[PDB]
From Swiss-Prot, chains A, B:
Cleaves the C-terminus of replicase polyprotein at 11 sites. Recognizes substrates containing the core sequence [ILMVF]-Q-|-[SGACN]. Cleaves and inactivates human TRMT1, preventing tRNA guanine(26)-dimethylation of tRNAs. May cleave human NLRP1 in lung epithelial cells, thereby activating the NLRP1 inflammasome pathway. May cleave human GSDMD, triggering alternative GSDME-mediated epithelial cell death upon activation of the NLRP1 inflammasome, which may enhance the release interleukins 1B, 6, 16 and 18. Also able to bind an ADP-ribose-1''-phosphate (ADRP). Residues 1-301 are cytoplasmic. The gene is rep. It catalyses: TSAVLQ-|-SGFRK-NH2 and SGVTFQ-|-GKFKK the two peptides corresponding to the two self-cleavage sites of the SARS 3C-like proteinase are the two most reactive peptide substrates. The enzyme exhibits a strong preference for substrates containing Gln at P1 position and Leu at P2 position. It comes from Severe acute respiratory syndrome coronavirus 2. This is 3C-like proteinase nsp5. Residues 1-301 form the Peptidase C30 domain. Inhibited by pyridone-containing alpha-ketoamides compounds 13a and 13b. In turn, alpha-ketoamide 13b (tert-butyl (1-((S)-1-(((S)-4-(benzylamino)-3,4-dioxo-1-((S)-2-oxopyrrolidin-3-yl)butan-2-yl)amino)-3-cyclopropyl-1-oxopropan-2-yl)-2-oxo-1,2-dihydropyridin-3-yl)carbamate) inhibits SARS-CoV-2 replication in human lung cells. Inhibited ex vivo by michael acceptor inhibitor N3. Inhibited ex vivo by compound 11a and 11b. Changing residue 189 to A: Does not affect ability to cleave and inactivate human TRMT1. There is a cross-link at residues 5, 90 (Glycyl lysine isopeptide (Lys-Gly) (interchain with G-Cter in ubiquitin)). It is found in: Host cytoplasm; Host Golgi apparatus; Host nucleus. The active site is at residues 41, 145. 3CL-PRO exists as monomer and homodimer. Only the homodimer shows catalytic activity. Interacts with host FBXO22; this interaction promotes the proteasomal degradation of nsp5.
Length: 301, 301
């Protein structure tokens, strides 16, 4: 029993974290084989950020302008290249602790574990989701750039996020491991803001199933709904639309509890219309949307 | 910016997790040097749990009755002893990945990271506190016995918990790494239940300071209180008493925000009397008590 925000074990990622230095900027890098991956804004001054031409800036740099530090040892940079918004520093030593890995670009609504680092040393690990507006509600301070988001499948690490910036609302923006930003964000100092966010509906339904698995079913009812009628109420409460694909993804959780997806949708509809009336679900007074149907399966009985 | 439930990086602990087998029971063990630590109930059948005499049960066992498996390799048990409610299996190989470590017995209200394991393999990591009633609100399934709780100070791992059982309310009970249970719990099948729990007051105050550090201050007021008058209201709402020592521990957070501890106590008093009036604090509709003043300092600006 129990249900907690659960991150993947961070060991395979810790052995990859290095510190990257360029001039007066210090951030983190991800050391995999003989290549160190990091945000390309490491080469910029604050003045360069106003209207940067990175191709023109990188041509002014040499290999000796980059400093890589792994624990105590200093790695020599023997090459450098840019791919989108990430810099790839070729080093003279291949990382002996490189795990089996993949670079994957995730969809909005998907979750991942974050290993927050400062100066090449991991500080902590936590779980979060890619919000529908393509920002993340993380916990990041100055120097956290280069920290990564990931999931673990068997023994393979799937890196899905690299941290780059904090927006004015306190939310965070970054790229996949190939340097493509999630959302309409760019790596330059411009007026950029997060768009309106919505609640991840398939995730709320998965978390209500986890609550049933853990023994709390006060919120259930005898009603059912159509996919269309539920979607009419979802749009009203700023919820993401539920597709037939989401219903299929929720199938294994529906078969374990005995509650049809459309029956669970009628409980969610009543919870949104009537509130909780002073009651909690898995220790929460608010509906939770940062657990995917896969996360519930992995942690539950 | 941001504030999340943050666990310590779990790498140093993952390299210690092994699978222990005795007869038909399989649980996890903690491999440190040439000793494997695990719950002593691994030697018992379900029938033995009714009224066990462990000294008499352990004398019937040989070294070959114990099976230790670290990844692919099988470790030979060359000795065995019991210390309180933990079994210590001496093995022929010292763990090459043993970190710098300590065994520490924590006070109620203190937090730690849990690395949940099944069959010697870590499944995930999450944060929790030792509740005032000496149980933990964890997330554990069958086979999780031997999973450990810990904190990390610089490069030293402080192990504070080993998992043993789940009580009827779904909460969890276990020992320190020297085999002494937290609370009045025993490792036998008897009617045992968690006592009444209370809210960890110094932790709620620390989390309100974290909210001020992150920019939300709607809950502040112009009032102050005495330590005695605040304690009169705390007892009424089932909160732990606040001592002068707790006030001193909250000093660095009080000096960073400019808000006196007794001023923060008057905000908490009003929050308990009037509620939140449809408002949240750090994304939470309930007051949070599983962040110590040290946890806030470690993660905040």
């Amino acid at each position: 029993s129990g249900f907690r925000k659960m991150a993947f074990p961070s060991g395979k990622v810790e052995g990859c974290m290095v510190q990257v230095t360029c001039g007066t900027t210090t951030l983190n890098g991800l050391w995999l084989d003989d290549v160190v991956y990091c945000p390309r804004h490491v080469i910029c001054t604050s003045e360069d950020m106003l209207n940067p031409n990175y191709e023109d800036l990188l041509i002014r740099k040499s290999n000796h302008n980059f400093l890589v530090q792994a624990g105590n040892v200093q790695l020599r940079v023997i090459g450098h290249s840019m791919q989108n918004c990430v810099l790839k520093l070729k080093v003279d030593t291949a990382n002996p602790k490189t795990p089996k890995y993949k670079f994957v670009r995730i969809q909005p609504g998907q979750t991942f574990s974050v290993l927050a680092c400062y100066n090449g040393s991991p500080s902590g690990v936590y779980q979060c989701a890619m919000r529908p507006n393509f920002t993340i509600k993380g916990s990041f301070l100055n120097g956290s750039c280069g920290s990564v988001g990931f999931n673990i499948d068997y023994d393979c690490v799937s890196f899905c996020y690299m941290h780059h910036m904090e927006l004015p609302t306190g939310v965070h923006a970054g790229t996949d491991l190939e340097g493509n930003f999630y959302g309409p964000f760019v790596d330059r100092q411009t007026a950029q803001a997060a768009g309106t966010d919505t609640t991840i509906t398939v995730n709320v339904l998965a978390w209500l199933y986890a609550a049933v698995i853990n023994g709390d079913r006060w919120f259930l009812n005898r009603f059912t709904t159509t996919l269309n009628d539920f979607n009419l109420v979802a749009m009203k409460y700023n919820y993401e639309p539920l597709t037939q694909d989401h219903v299929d993804i929720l199938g294994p959780l529906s078969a374990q509890t005995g509650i049809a997806v459309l029956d669970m949708c009628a409980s969610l509809k009543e919870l949104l219309q009537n509130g909780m009336n002073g009651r909690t679900i898995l220790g929460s007074a608010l509906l939770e949307d940062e657990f995917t149907p896969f996360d519930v399966v992995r942690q539950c009985s």
